[PDB]
């Protein structure tokens, strides 16, 4: 589910050709260069979350921390309620989206 | 620039 070398738009457009609704990937992160973002499809659309990385664990700014990102992907594929953005909109990561 | 979410965990 990494994609080493993809932009935030190169993201949408393979999650909106080559996914559905659900797929994600995670990417290096253009506005917080060496840390990463996950980019998510729901309901045709592309929606793009940051993960932050202290050094001691990553999370999403906020929520369960995590020792790995791949911890912390691993947690949300299995936990799809856990992301409520602030609308009360769930984002739901459920299909990993491959290189 | 893309959009991004602002979580409420």
Redesign the interface.
């Known amino acids: 589910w990494f994609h080493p070398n993809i932009t935030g738009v190169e993201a949408e457009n393979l999650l909106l050709t080559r996914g559905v609704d659900g797929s994600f990937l995670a990417r290096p992160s253009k506005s917080n260069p060496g840390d990463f973002t996950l980019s998510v499809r729901r309901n045709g659309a592309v929606t793009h979350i940051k993960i932050q990385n202290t050094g001691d664990y990553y999370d999403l700014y906020g929520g369960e921390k995590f020792a790995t990102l791949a911890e912390l992907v691993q947690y949300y594929m299995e936990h799809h309620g856990q992301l409520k953005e602030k609308n009360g909109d769930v984002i739901e990561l459920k299909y990993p989206l491959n290189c | 620039?893309?959009?991004?979410?602002?979580?409420?965990?």
């Open positions: 620039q893309v959009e991004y979410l602002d979580l409420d965990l």
